[PDB]
Enzyme design. Structure first.
Site, PDB file in Angstrom:
ATOM      1  CG  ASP B 215      16.750  -5.770 -31.422  1.00  0.00           C
ATOM      2  OD1 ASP B 215      17.795  -6.640 -31.335  1.00  0.00           O
ATOM      3  OD2 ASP B 215      16.436  -5.120 -30.203  1.00  0.00           O
ATOM      4  CG  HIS B 216      20.234 -10.428 -35.929  1.00  0.00           C
ATOM      5  ND1 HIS B 216      19.572 -11.552 -35.898  1.00  0.00           N
ATOM      6  CD2 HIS B 216      21.241 -10.853 -36.803  1.00  0.00           C
ATOM      7  CE1 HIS B 216      19.964 -12.747 -36.735  1.00  0.00           C
ATOM      8  NE2 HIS B 216      21.187 -12.034 -37.049  1.00  0.00           N
ATOM      9  NE  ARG B 217      18.895  -6.614 -28.434  1.00  0.00           N
ATOM     10  CZ  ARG B 217      18.731  -5.639 -27.801  1.00  0.00           C
ATOM     11  NH1 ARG B 217      19.483  -5.537 -26.558  1.00  0.00           N
ATOM     12  NH2 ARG B 217      17.919  -4.593 -27.887  1.00  0.00           N
ATOM     13  CB  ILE B 219      13.554 -10.485 -35.747  1.00  0.00           C
ATOM     14  CG1 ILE B 219      12.269 -10.557 -35.142  1.00  0.00           C
ATOM     15  CG2 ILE B 219      13.322 -10.765 -36.916  1.00  0.00           C
ATOM     16  CD1 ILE B 219      11.494  -9.351 -34.804  1.00  0.00           C
TER      17      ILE B 219
END
Ligand SMILES: CC(C)(COP(=O)(O)OP(=O)(O)OC[C@H]1O[C@@H](n2cnc3c(N)ncnc32)[C@H](O)[C@@H]1OP(=O)(O)O)[C@@H](O)C(=O)NCCC(=O)NCCSO
Ligand SMILES: CC(C)(COP(=O)(O)OP(=O)(O)OC[C@H]1O[C@@H](n2cnc3c(N)ncnc32)[C@H](O)[C@@H]1OP(=O)(O)O)[C@@H](O)C(=O)NCCC(=O)NCCSO
Ligand SMILES: CC(C)(COP(=O)(O)OP(=O)(O)OC[C@H]1O[C@@H](n2cnc3c(N)ncnc32)[C@H](O)[C@@H]1OP(=O)(O)O)[C@@H](O)C(=O)NCCC(=O)NCCSO
Lengths: 243, 243, 243
Positions: B215-217, B219
């Site tokens: 989850d790029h938000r 990580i």
């Protein structure tokens, strides 16, 4: 979905506006519709096409005598047709109740052609019943009509599955977008020579890169790793289609 | 989100409707919810499991004497447990204010089982405290119960991270979907023998393909390239877990 | 889009809340906005940087004498600048009517820096006009200011394209998210020695992994397989930029 803020791009330097063709705008809309409706996964695999390639090349005379050029696309189309019948969930669409699949008993496969005006995906009907030279010829006709804007909507309808091949340009793999309402699409990138372990030593084998994207609501991870596996097996010995 | 237009699929040939199980419909809903909430990235890496493999195989007697079969999954579970504690952001969830992370001080890991009825993801609790043969045994029990529809919801709750392994079927890599509210999921594809450069020449090493989606938000790209790197390092010498 | 159900995570064990920096919350919002607006595809490719690397290393004295350290990033920036001018659709943005592209006649490229506070993407202006040592120096300044929170918004504006390099940490490839309103972003992972077939035998070549993600509304699959191909060609002989 929140919109992107407009930016005065000309604050940074000179800009120029070129307009999109209606084909591109149709194209843009449909991709975004699929992107937001289909939870996408891509399963990568490589098939050993060393022998398939030597076959392709030896039938060059037969093909030339028939007026067709036998590329890799008819061999891909025959194999995905056989598999779309062994693994029927790949040949189906989610019903709009979202509570059922509609399994199609026919196999018509589309293939992506990139034209100046934009992307077109002509469809070959009953791929399961045509032969490598019939498919070679038809593929070539549909693509020529497609490039000449002489393709009629009749031939862009009712596909079950899409093949999108960029092998003729390059790259190692990509993640295609599912052409909803279909449930999967095969991307094919460029074949290159590779060392493959034979039990004792590495042998150069000609490897074809496959990228299957699928609608994970309808196909689970193991069904798709099994589809790319069977396809890799079929392309490594296309006589298994005879069985 | 715009819907997909319905198509009368029967205009193209015979169709058949088969219905989805409620497990699949639950499954379909959750994936779509994650797809639309999590901006997904996948980080690929390969780990050298040549020595891990030779260890697995030499402990075959010990495992058989204990009644368990020691597969690769307990070794993956032990290593991801150690790492979920070295890199705590991977063991956390975004709070619903979207302004905080809730870091979990426990490590329970789920693993995907594909059953006829659909996908189930049983959870092993306190993976960080169990041993390879305890994890081997428990993994096998949960999967057998899962296949027999005898798994109870209690055991499908409160995981921190998911492992999804298709190595037993094939493929080269895939892009799994994050099982929200978790923040990452490891996909594991099939190990194959590969030439790896040793400074002087290429040596055949048994390479395991890893695909971490996150989850790029929560990580960023460097934290995740560092997670797959540490995992590749741990699997190449699992004694580093002793340290 | 449906929300994720809240879970009392403390039912499973001890939890701890740590809060997100405003940089991370800004970051989280923008990624989600891009994720939902851009139908994403990633095109993978590997470039042969054996010779580029030997050049980099021989100019170590010149660079040291100039006070800069010549890494791979200036060489990537020069090449993507040349290409953003050969293939202008990659240097453009979709107008908010969705019926036009705004082609930018300038080339400013941003590059991702991961800082403790979160992700920052400083921009170098007119990359097409600066030299490898000018780009080396500027890149290093912007990143140092970025890490020291001394970077001012002026320098985070009006980029045309983004490079995101994780080569310094590891991994094999990843799928970056497009930084809307730009239309593409290059991910660069770690270079490793590889056997490459030369017609007769396999030669060890130092291969750089490239991952181009693009906005498929605006770029079609063949334009992007051609972008990674040209880039692989340019990095294999950077003198072609002289032409
Ligand atoms: C029959 C067809 C419709 C598709 O043909 P195709 O399978 O793409 O082959 P092609 O266009 O001849 O490809 C160009 C060259 O690259 C090769 N190539 C194709 N696939 C390749 C692959 N996956 N790996 C490596 N090289 C490849 C071809 O065999 C051909 O080699 P030669 O020119 O040396 O014979 C053809 O007439 C056509 O219009 N081709 C243009 C490209 C295209 O749009 N393909 C769409 C497929 S989806
Ligand atoms: C313990 C477990 C739950 C999971 O076991 P597993 O780690 O998947 O191993 P497995 O099922 O025995 O795998 C089948 C074979 O392929 C091998 N395999 C597993 N991972 C592999 C990998 N990543 N690369 C190559 N081969 C692999 C196995 O070691 C095994 O080899 P043998 O049969 O020759 O011993 C098992 O009892 C089970 O139910 N397995 C079925 C498959 C499954 O659902 N796995 C879920 C993991 S998520
Ligand atoms: C100029 C720059 C801004 C970017 O530099 P860079 O190109 O990333 O190089 P770097 O940071 O020196 O990288 C560290 C090491 O890994 C190497 N490396 C970089 N790219 C690599 C790649 N793609 N493959 C393999 N190794 C790589 C470097 O060349 C360097 O080797 P040495 O330390 O042995 O000389 C630098 O001053 C900096 O701040 N670096 C920190 C890392 C970073 O944030 N990079 C952002 C790029 S987007």
């Amino acid at each position: 979905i929140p919109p992107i803020p407009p930016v005065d791009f000309a604050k940074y330097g000179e800009i120029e506006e070129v307009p999109m063709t209606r084909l591109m705008q149709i194209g843009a809309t449909n991709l975004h519709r699929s992107w937001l409706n289909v939870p996408h996964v891509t399963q990568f695999e490589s098939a050993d096409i060393t022998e398939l390639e030597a076959f392709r090349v030896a039938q060059k005379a037969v093909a030339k005598k028939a007026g067709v050029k036998l590329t890799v696309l008819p061999l891909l189309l025959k194999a995905c047709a056989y598999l779309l019948k062994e693994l029927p969930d790949f040949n189906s669409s989610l019903a709009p109740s979202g509570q059922a699949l509609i399994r199609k008993k026919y196999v018509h496969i589309g293939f992506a052609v990139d034209t100046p005006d934009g992307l077109l995906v002509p469809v070959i009907r009953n791929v399961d019943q045509k032969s490598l030279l019939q498919l070679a010829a038809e593929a070539a006709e549909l693509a020529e009509k497609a490039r000449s804007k002489k393709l009629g909507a009749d031939a862009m309808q009712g596909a079950c599955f899409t093949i999108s091949s960029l092998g003729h340009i390059g790259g190692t793999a990509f993640t295609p977008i599912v052409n909803a309402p279909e449930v999967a699409i095969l991307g094919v990138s460029k074949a290159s020579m590779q060392p493959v372990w034979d039990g004792k030593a590495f042998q150069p084998r000609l490897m074809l890169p496959l990228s299957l994207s699928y609608d994970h609501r309808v196909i689970n991870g193991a069904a798709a790793a099994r589809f790319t596996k069977r396809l890799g097996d079929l392309l490594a010995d296309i006589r298994a289609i005879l069985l």
